[model samples]
Target: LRWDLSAQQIEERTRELIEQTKRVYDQVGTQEFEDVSYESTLKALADVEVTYTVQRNILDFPQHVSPSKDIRTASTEADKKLSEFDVEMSMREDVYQRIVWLQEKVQKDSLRPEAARYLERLIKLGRRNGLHLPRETQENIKRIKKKLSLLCIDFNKNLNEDTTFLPFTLQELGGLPEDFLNSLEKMEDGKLKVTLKYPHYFPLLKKCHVPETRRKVEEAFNSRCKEENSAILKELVTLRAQKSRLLGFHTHADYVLEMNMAKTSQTVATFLDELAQKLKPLGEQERAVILELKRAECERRGLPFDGRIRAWDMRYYMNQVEETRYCVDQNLLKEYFPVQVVTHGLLGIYQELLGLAFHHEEGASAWHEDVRLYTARDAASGEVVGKFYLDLYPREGKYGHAACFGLQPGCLRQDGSRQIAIAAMVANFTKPTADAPSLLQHDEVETYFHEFGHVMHQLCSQAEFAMFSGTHVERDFVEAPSQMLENWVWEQEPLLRMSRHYRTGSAVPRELLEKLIESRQANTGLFNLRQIVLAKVDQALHTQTDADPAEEYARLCQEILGVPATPGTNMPATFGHLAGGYDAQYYGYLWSEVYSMDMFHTRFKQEGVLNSKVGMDYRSCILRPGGSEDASAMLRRFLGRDPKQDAFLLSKGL
Candidate 1:
């Protein structure tokens, strides 16, 4: 696939690809049942999806990384059309009938395992799309789904585009950095503009000494899209319930979870429910430590303390513990983590552990000057496994986020030949200045590891269908493989590989690394409990017909986290995970983490962290299978037992 297509070429190619895809689907629709076979119909139908997928990704990828305005516009426009085409085409009754006929008449006739899975999934999707419903209901289902899609788009745009700002004085911004002060937009009233963006909000919460400032920041951050998108959530939740019920499912969670590893909303709730009790006592103990710090500060400053931690106070006091008790300074952590050092070190670690070799292709063309191209080769056979482009720097009008975009997926074709994977890992890290290279905060380093885990997942797959290729598994299980890799970052062994001081040319000192690791678990209880509340709220909203998420969220926060919900605030309205339509699947984060920790402790810890045999086993069993088999099956194969939450609990010190 090429990255250097003109705007006109992209426009023309996207249209042509859609038309080509339609022709193949038409082969299945127009041919008689007697004439149909898996080779001519189903196999051909999916093989074209690879071509369509690669080209469609080429059409879509530019908007996120391209600097050219017309090119970005072209890609965005084409991406929208393709999304519309997917929704329209997937429910085609003629195609649906052919899929059903294959299942009914073929009767497991000469189908390969993956092909059988393909057949079953297609039929499952057709039923889920209400293909068996009456004609009137069919139109209704389509219309509501289409409406829901548009609503989600609207919800996301507000979250992204709307620059919610609050004005704060120097007095209010006390205890924060001067550079942070100088960087803020100046206002005539001698105040600075503080937007509710993460860069400003997160630091402000932890650093600003003024409790009033933190409260205002917290309130404004929570209230983002409140007036703009509050009722949007209620309508979104209610509509989801209606659509799920329309599809003959009792709850939205039921409809959604059937495709997930959890299989039922109750299972997810049960997973979270047990974690709630385990976490509460630990959270309270953690809170007691922070509360003492607050008490000491309160008496010293003569500020009245209610002996209750305000929502805004957690960041300040939690950070206080790390800075004072653990002596962990984020700026100090950065010195040992220059971006290039981390990059090269990480590449070396992956090459050794995953049994692969990487080569940089300096001659390759890229979307931007900052982009780098590389190819991964399987070490055993020296086979070229995959190609990837790394776009790591920011530009004006770029889609500012970190993600591994699969430009093409791996699959064994109809002819028994294999197609290799291609991916682009796009991110916007800080640009290096002339004086020094960009350095990463420890959290950013953690993020770097987590994201590259997604890239490894994309590049390592050997699935038999594009539909089952890397990152195509159930949403709940998709994060597990990647999440497991984050442990390497936290452990001392992997930390030494990646962390080196830019000036001193020394790896992270043992003392510093030890404190850093220890500090990570400082408030594990309180922070994780927060996630449980949100996940519980997401589950509650989707599991029932009449869900008042705004009301339910506050109640659950108190019940689960024992944290009082701030009065006059609607946090769920601003929860992009829910309002922007993950529906019942928000618990996937913790669900996957449970499996992730299990894999880490069982394999990586038991054998050795950097053991080549264990890594190869992980690549073959977990990454290679991709979504070709059920993730449950893959886990059992990898773990040699059913996965559980024991390791996850221990990791959290529960």
Candidate 2:
């Protein structure tokens, strides 16, 4: 478990875990049908999965953060091997039969909630793995699963490793901050380098007033991981379709949704369509505002003013409107949120609300020095609840987005003792500079809160089985808790408490904070419509077996977004979600937001933002049990009623 291990040592450890899993499988596979029990069958498999999860986490340390290519390669190999092992284990007839036998034995009698939940998933997992299929079909399923694991890995690898850049002269860097312009490296000819990294690309596209510059940068970003990745994505979806058909499902969406809260592709499509219908008029209204501004700008510059708004122009014009109309400058706000001040206040908020204290685990070895380890303990009980690592900067091979990696699950051992959970939160925020510390914009601050929500979910879990551990719930419901936390950042009290000037060490000006809060609801219709379009595209791509993703994406962009797709812009090529965990579940972001806002408005509305009792109740009811019970049941138990979409719609300014 030491972080000092070399790449070879890490690979060796992974293989050792796989061997241990095989031994466990062998033991359980030999159990007589009459003697099979939940403990002997389901628990044993869950324990094995936990081991593999731990191994995978260790391997991921290199794949994500390691600077060396050799280490990343080793990590990818280990991951593929582990994934193939998992598929092989799932397809085993002996293990599947043992699971069925245990389920039958328990069907005649009453069972505890966790035990029943575990048994249900055990049966479902077996069926989903093609356990009921003939030998040839099962073999084909195995082949497809292994192929998918590698394809997903490669699809992400292209995104992480490809270094596409758009070179710009100093004259072309219009409207960008001096510090931002100074941060980039210049060639002998003095052209600045801008890559697709969010810290670099987002600011450029958002702030640069030169239409051609923004257009070039946006095109480069849109076409990232193109050609090769396009091929991989096509093959990946096709394989998913083939696999679903082999498993007696109509499409990939049908297969993936069987275990999700929505439970069917038709239901998800209906939900998306209904929401899009409501949002379309609002979106057009918002776009009209942007188009008016664009026309004025064009007239001022003496350029041809076509009424059409390009996708690249949205952020630029939106930022212009927000600044000129609302006077909410992002740079003015960033000065208040120095990373250190925000981190301390963030930890303090959680400590006060959740009754847990986080202490930095000094001297803890990690893959990088910037990776901080923290131990969480109950404030009253003083018991160590869990540990988490924070890696909060960009690096060559690191994952480009913010996420919480669940390394080890919290579960009770066979001897009735509890195991501590472990997790890591990775993010690519701007690194600290010599003249100034790393400062967070409002959106980055929201991202930090959102990812921390996942960390707390993992650490706060008291689930008895690894299978139901934190963040392992239904794919459609997994984002609700995290989305719920994002609302806190927008609240007046917390935003004021969390802000401090990097240089002066004083709180943000009250007027500035109010302006920020006031402006939050602006353009929300357009903002949410963008998400709706993405969810729609995700569902459409997965549901239609013969759809061409490229053409479909272009059509949807023009029809739904009111922005024509630029020629040669291949967005689906770099959509990591489609190839990774999300697949057809991208709609979960907005879907979960419905319940998230509902939870906040219903429960926290009366108690205020810092209510300790509400926090503890949420911990116990929603988080601690993890996926031990159904997500809808948990929400109902917490809300005391069925969840409604009124909060979500109102939040979107519909």
Candidate 3:
């Protein structure tokens, strides 16, 4: 990959890519009608996506991770231009007809499933691109799409560029640990400054004793991109609704969901209702448990307590429960999870389980000093499978959350050679200070396992088409493999292997491991309830055109989870998923858990958790297939039957 290009270089390269793409499209555009074949038409069309994805990702990625503002600006501009270029390309009748004609003449059933699916995918993409509509209508769609892509870029860029922080005196932020305090920047007046970045914001919210401090911090964090992004988000919703209808769908949700595992929005609504209703009783009880603790704290402070818990109260009070009642303290728990030891142990776990080996390179070309690189290869056959980078700390202009960014996708090329995938796991954990080594909270370790699951998914792909490789699966089913892998963190054996105290180099004590496992389901009810709430809010915005997204989200929160949204703050403003790709599909987190637990229970739980044979089966069935086949078929192949919700309900303690 092109590692650190200058602004001018990026612009020039992007322009060259556009010309190169058109040159290839021109060949397909002028092809003879009756002589159009799979090799020249269908495979050629598929090859375009492959080459385009590889280069487009290179041009698009630096906006999120690059250190230089100039490069980021250039990358963002290039992304917008390429997206507009793609908007026109998608509507190109000259190129679209040749692929269509091949399928028409050769017949979809006559080709192999992968080729046939490629044909279907191209046609479906065209249909969604408004190719079937009139020229003027398609023009309108392209215009709206170009505008929407820019809006999305600006929305995310606003979040990344925001340096919003609130200054607090030592007493105002009293309950936070000294190490955490020392990590913050000090002001002229000696107040510690807290930014909306996860390292500062989440720790402050979870640990601060002052109610007013938590409230202000929570408000600022939630309001990260409030005014500008709120308008941008609402406009995005309207334009998406307009585009979907112009393409003959009733709502944006319908347009998006028809390609997902949940084929319709109604099916999603029903699925959410079923899960929420069953989980509501437990959710209510858990909320009450934390509320009672809030009341007791108020009584101790000689203050009157409200029966209701505010949105800010949930995390703080639940964390309080985890410490006082459940014998779990994240501050203490973090000591045993020194970042490097945890990283090495986690790598060993994946290597053992998947019959693959990970070699950590001491010196490699990387974007940051903190970024580490690893290469994966099949253990027995010694074939290089893929490479990945771990960028696990925060900086000023970096993306503010945890995710697996696919750098390069794996594909079986037309020349019978395979392209190895490359991915990066980006996250914001606490940085190591002069006194303390970088340590991970148990939950952060769980997240480490989860994001690495996507790396595994990307690296192990056996799909022939880039469109179907790696994380190209149906939206609702994509998270199941990773979610199931998160179960590894909750198990005592894996936790034992993954933890080593930073100072003393001691393993986590047996009782502590037991408590960590015991609390794995800690607040699972409220957690799942919040998932349903967010998923519903995503659906609400995408399924209709008229509702205010923030107001509707708050209303749903009150109605479903009994948690009040902060007044006057726009929640969806920083909701990157809605603005990014998971517009109507956020329910996939909970939706995928059905398959998550089914696979875990049927395979890993019954067989040994780290059983190589079972892991091999999993790698083949789920990771290897990528999105080449339907997720349901993958599940059946892995589990030997239809997926059942019994394990899912049990996992939730229902």
Candidate 3 achieves a global lDDT of: 0.87
Better of 1 and 2 by TM-score: 1
For each candidate, how many residue pairs have backbone atoms clashing (under 3 Å)? 0, 0, 0
Best TM-score among the predictions, by candidate number: 1
Report the C-alpha lDDT of model 2 over 469-490, residue by residue, as the tens digit.
8888987788898888889898
lDDT by residue for model 3 over 486-507, one digit each (tens)? Answer: 9999898898889888999888
How many pairs in model 3 have backbone atoms within 3 A of each other, for residues 3 or more apart or on separate chains, i.e. clashes? 0
For model 1, how does the per-residue alpha-carbon lDDT over 65-119 read when each residue is reduced to its tens digit?
8899999999999999998888778878888888777777776457878888888
The lDDT values for all models are: 0.85, 0.84, 0.87
Pick the winner on lDDT between candidates 1 and 2: 1
Error of 2 at 124 (Å): 1.3
- Which 10 successive residues of model 2 have the least lDDT summed? 1-10
Off by over 4 Å in 1: 150-167, 182-199, 224-230, 431-434
- Candidate 2 regions with alpha-carbon error over 4 angstroms: 6-8, 50-77, 139-239, 359-373, 390-401, 427-436, 548-551, 566-576
Q: What is the C-alpha RMSD of each candidate to the true structure, in Å?
A: 2.2, 4.0, 4.1
